[PDB]
Amino acid sequence: GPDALAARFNASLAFDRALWREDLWQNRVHARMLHAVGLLSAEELEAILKGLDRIEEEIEAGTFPWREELEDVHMNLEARLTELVGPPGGKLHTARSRNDQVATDLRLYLRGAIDELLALLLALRRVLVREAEKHLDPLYVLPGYTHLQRAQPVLLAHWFLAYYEMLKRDAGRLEDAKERLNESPLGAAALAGTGFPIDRHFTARELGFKAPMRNSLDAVASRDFALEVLSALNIGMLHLSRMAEELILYSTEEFGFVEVPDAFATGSSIMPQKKNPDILELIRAKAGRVLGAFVGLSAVVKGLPLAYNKDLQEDKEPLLDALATYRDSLRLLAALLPGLKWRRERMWRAAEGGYTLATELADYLAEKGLPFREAHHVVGRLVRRLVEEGRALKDLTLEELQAHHPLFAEDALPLLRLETAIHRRRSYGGTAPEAVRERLEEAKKEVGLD
Amino acid sequence: PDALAARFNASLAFDRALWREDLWQNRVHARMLHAVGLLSAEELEAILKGLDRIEEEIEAGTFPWREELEDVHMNLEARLTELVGPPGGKLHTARSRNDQVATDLRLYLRGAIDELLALLLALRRVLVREAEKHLDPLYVLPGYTHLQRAQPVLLAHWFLAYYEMLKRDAGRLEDAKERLNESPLGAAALAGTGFPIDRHFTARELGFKAPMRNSLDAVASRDFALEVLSALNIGMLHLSRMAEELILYSTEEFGFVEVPDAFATGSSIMPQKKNPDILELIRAKAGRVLGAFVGLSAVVKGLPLAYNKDLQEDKEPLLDALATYRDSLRLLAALLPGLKWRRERMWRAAEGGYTLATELADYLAEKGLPFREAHHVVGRLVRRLVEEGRALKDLTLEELQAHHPLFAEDALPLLRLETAIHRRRSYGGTAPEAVRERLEEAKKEVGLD
Amino acid sequence: GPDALAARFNASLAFDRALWREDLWQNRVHARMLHAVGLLSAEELEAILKGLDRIEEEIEAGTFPWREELEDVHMNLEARLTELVGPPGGKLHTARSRNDQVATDLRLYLRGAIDELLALLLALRRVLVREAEKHLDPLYVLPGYTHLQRAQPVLLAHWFLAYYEMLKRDAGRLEDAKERLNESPLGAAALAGTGFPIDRHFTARELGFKAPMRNSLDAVASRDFALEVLSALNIGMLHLSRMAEELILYSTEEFGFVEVPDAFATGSSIMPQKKNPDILELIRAKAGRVLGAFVGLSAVVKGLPLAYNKDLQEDKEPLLDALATYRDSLRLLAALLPGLKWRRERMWRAAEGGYTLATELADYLAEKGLPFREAHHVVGRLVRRLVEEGRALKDLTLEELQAHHPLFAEDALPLLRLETAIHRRRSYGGTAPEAVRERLEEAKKEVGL
Amino acid sequence: PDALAARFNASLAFDRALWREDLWQNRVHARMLHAVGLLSAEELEAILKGLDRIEEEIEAGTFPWREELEDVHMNLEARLTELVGPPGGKLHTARSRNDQVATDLRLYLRGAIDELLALLLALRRVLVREAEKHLDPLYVLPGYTHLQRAQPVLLAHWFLAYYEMLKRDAGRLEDAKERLNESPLGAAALAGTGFPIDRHFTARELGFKAPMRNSLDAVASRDFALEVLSALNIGMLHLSRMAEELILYSTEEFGFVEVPDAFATGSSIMPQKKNPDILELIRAKAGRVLGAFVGLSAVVKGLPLAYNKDLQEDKEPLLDALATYRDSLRLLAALLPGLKWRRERMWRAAEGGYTLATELADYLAEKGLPFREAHHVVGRLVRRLVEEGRALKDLTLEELQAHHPLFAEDALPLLRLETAIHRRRSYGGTAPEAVRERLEEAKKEVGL
Ligand SMILES: NC(=[NH2+])NCCC[C@H](N)C(=O)O
Ligand SMILES: NC(=[NH2+])NCCC[C@H](N)C(=O)O
Ligand SMILES: NC(=[NH2+])NCCC[C@H](N)C(=O)O
């Protein structure tokens, strides 16, 4: 250190280079505007634009002189342009400040990041719907949980479609975030506009923005959009952490419901049936670094006076990490889910326990007028005796069920064996194979699979 | 032990808040039961009759809150049956506590989010009126960057910077509101039910857009809660930037604005020292809302599907965040109109001897000087003026015109605030000309004429 | 009502009431000092002192005039002393500011609360030790997990002692936290001492502080201790959240390793094989709110200029909530552990699976002289072949072993069975009963039982 | 999607930061294998010469870091076998990556906290130097409350508040250090070993106070990491408080101090503007450390016992927090000394015409008057002054005796900051003698 420590400490080039494309795009657009407005001569724009192509080629070919000494990506492209085309380069940044320049780059970068994220979610929602179908044919059933205690029986199909609704809501948050941040700060200069004959509506259009921001001060100081995106990303990983958790569980000897693909696991030589879900674990675990990011940036913008402040530079690092995290997580789950091997039978024996369907017998009485609570006790004694006699609920006979309580009839019988009892919960959103299938149709039409 | 485990599990303490919501879904629920046969016309009449007594009882503070029943749901039920007899025991038919509490929370956040949208609207309105006020006589203060005087800014412009910020906060509250307005009732414990229950009837009667299409999701998802807490945070965070700034602009050092007596405290002795207590609390409260978001996020991470007891740790944080934001939206809309901004002091601060020198540079730049160069030029002139102990205003045509052949008469107007503020008239800038259209425009979006 | 809201919003009495004691105990020591220094006559000292004793009575009677219009516990207790003893009352708060007072109170309140916490933690580690010793003989074994996958057989006694280590370190964090905040801020008065000939070493000494804080500014402005305590609480619940996770898990119909006492669970009317671990769920989930609290407060002090600010008020609520969470959690846990039922057989069967002990078989060959790698291929080939022959590791004959590898010999036979194999990892800190019994003894002398 | 997963799973990109500690641990483990009897002498004195080559290679940039191997552990190993041959593959005898990585992190932090302690002692050392420097001609600025001028305070006093603060920070780090200095090496995968492994030997040679007493705990615990982050967070929080104030005192509005050119930015156009870039970053970076703490906590919540891949999310946030506090601690020690405090603008603002009207209340009340009224009496006075457009430095003993008989002549020195600044002489007070006292206490605590 210490002048070096200072330099290093202040520099953002180590991470802001990730936005070089957004800075290039803005450059072309902004340079073209300076021309249209009279601030730049055709000869000049021509050079700047010619020079900007060489820069991009140099970057894509790993020959661009990235210099930390130049502090950020902004001055880096600028310095380079001026080395490539003499004087013209030194006019590209006319009527502009880093302030409005940074916020434009960041927003520009997120819109793309989000569009790529929305793409990644469609793919995931597709594998989901696809997996739901693949396990609806030979009907797959397993236990639904509560307090991690088995409750009523559920279909893998209904289960996959559970994450379908979840991931669908995520896509809508990233969407609404995207739309809302799609304003342009370019043209706000340092904090108050300029006297320069600038044209912000032009720069807004050409750059994909719905319109230019209406307040130069907020244009330069706002980062609430970064926060909105980080939250979307937070909630998303939380949904993914839920699924990793369950797949990690059902992947245990204790459950034995599913085998994770070798590609996303590690085993053991000296050991037979052992396989560790490292990738599912890291996805589950990575939800924290994304939460960590949201907390970090919120603390940053708290009580932060108005307009640009260097504190604001602390905004990029968290996002790039959060995005990469959520990006790569969505990609893996879509490459892993269809490679899953579900052990049907072990799931079925688990779903239809010894007396789990008794819940159904209770509802049956209730529907006929027997106070549902009153019915819960009569039905309880029934099973209680079955245990005493060491018999399952599948063995009950109609006569035997009739002695228990008059309300029972021939129709109650099909409710003793999972095979037919599942068709019961056919309300909108139930697990019943009819309700689930009906829903698998929408999902299909929705993600365009059919 | 014993009772500790009871009080520890009891969610009654705070879920009483959703009493109106619960009460409401009960009616809609019972009515649906009747519509599907599960309830006798005479039973519904009794049920509805008892639920009214309950409403009247709670309202009167005469209703019996029993912690032994652990939550709000069973409290209303125990009481209903205690009043109506057997019919009570039928209310909770074809329904689980899982889908019941869920419907309640999001049913309550819809109303809360409405009260909050109403508050923000109100708040935006006063920023706009406050903007119109300091626009004509014309208030101007320094724009800040790194907290150092940057460029003269119009106070009207300043209010509008927050107008757009709070405007975006409404968008998030709205969009979040619209997303949770799906009904989870009729989803049972996790799978659907066998009873001939109708979810569209309830969803619809209860105000929801439509029924949620997945029973598992419906009773396990609390993501809507996290989307609201996220907005509350960003919302409070916006309020802290304003509070911080008011706490700063009202110091003896700045001396830009004076806080209303109603929201501050002082000491008979020192006549100045006016402690901005309300604003500090507003600022420091951004912390709780952040914490609430972290708390809940942590609660739901890696939570196996369906209902889990953990999901109950969802109502306390919200209630607090909702309460913090609401109270803050109210206080500022009450406080801001009463601010006394010191025009002259603000005006002098803005024109700090050479702040307008940046205007001369753009001038050269626009005529033709590169800009990095134009900068060097006005700086060599600025240094000369500080040396000779002279302010930028005391420069003369020929002298300025001497420093660079590009300077002409039309540049003169740039040496004095009085006429320079009319400079940055680009879309979104502080030039009065400009702030005036963004001000008309705003007025229309909230109520002008 | 605006004026109404403003007051409510700022009112701290709702939660600082909790500190009535410390504020009281303080009012005493401070007065005795005001006298001993001459600012009060004995006829005044006695007056105030007796007025305080009455207050302690009115409070612990439900008769104290808790009045919100008074804003906080400090003036509420004061306004009353002037109502009970008259004129001498209005001198109790001489040479003291609400600043160094509220801080002195909190540091005092936490110290007491930490001791409680330390008793609770100490109590919990005893119960961990009781259960360890109990399940040592008869010898309880279960799977040692890794990636939540069966790894190597472990002892319930070792499991318990693991947590023992964890809770041992937590208390330690609480120790050093307390002994660090145990410096007195009383007498910093607002910031900067006073001309009053106060004796702060007196008030420091008589209020349990090892000493009075060396800098008034720091004394009034700091809350880093509140933050340090909160962190300890966080790590504490996190350790607990892990044990809670394993009991919720181990008590599932899938693992079947343990059964939770009904006092802390819930069941079903038409089922019996179901038992819900609500309390353990809630204990795990509430680790979130303590974390959110640390976050709340850290965000309040970030970039906070010096001396007192209204921002600090935000310190009490978070602390009270986290401290109560960890407290009841340490209590419920203690009462719940000794009463659960560990399934001997199910656990043992899961520990010694089909070939899980084969790893000990490879360590053998490696110790003998086979590159730890190589040996894996060999034993792996052995298991692979046993999987096909449809045989368990517990069937290999000395003959077959010597056939697979010449290095195998007699003393390898006991590695084939669990009953004789859990004696293998006898290294310091291992699971071999020889080793655990040694740490259990050590652990007993440590917690005095 | 093979490469994606590999990259997602790899920890090399960041865990390579702990190579020094990994190399040190290998040497000890080997030294112990040989002792214990699991390595011939030929073998040890081969693995060692190979661990020296690896060091030279790593420090020279010729060492082959391979992402494919995943972590630093396998990387070094792969090179050992490559460099020495068969002996290499026995270094990992009776050891897991689990007890190995836990150890390495503990090794790293220890050296880290020690580095941080030295930086704290260096910062506190300059704070004390600054206090002294500004006592000489004597600097006074207003103490604040609600960011409002409260009671005049000594700049030296101001510096000592932060000295007490960092002092406690050093304490949390110091206690966090030794609480985590117990070797987990030897716990193996999650339980000990049947191997005649020596755990106290490793611990000693590795600087540890002793071996962790429970294999399970040792391999599964990250509370030490959580503890260190917390200390970092709280410490950084102390720096942001100071940073904020320097940013604030250097505004054109307060004008108390100027930030050294080497840590600021400016413009020839506006020669009165000077941006505290480094200080604003030091303030802002309070957030990422906060978030680091949050993330690691979220990782360990509800996490089953033993090792879990989740525990790999421990190094990245810690490396980022450490570098943050580290650099922040350095910049300030370099920045503070170059500051230029404006004795007058400061002094001036302190004594604001009525400021000391508080000293007259503590007068009347000490003289026997009930404070609640004394403070009320002086109010009348100041009030009558604002109306007469008069100060408080102008007040005359008579006007005083006029207002309230308890006023004596010994009270005139309470109107001019020149003299009144000596009133607050209680322990820890802002009065010069009080401060001068503490300042000598501090000099000794470090270096006179
Ligand atoms: N003094 C200024 N206006 N600086 C603007 C720099 C912004 C910085 N490069 C960032 O990426 O956040
Ligand atoms: N075991 C249950 N189904 N409990 C339902 C109670 C839910 C609790 N009142 C909550 O708000 O989360
Ligand atoms: N203006 C003041 N000095 N107020 C002191 C009151 C502090 C308040 N009771 C708190 O706990 O933070």
Ligand SMILES: NC(=[NH2+])NCCC[C@H](N)C(=O)O
């Ligand atoms: N399956 C295992 N034992 N893996 C150990 C790898 C630990 C990983 N290198 C980390 O730093 O967290």
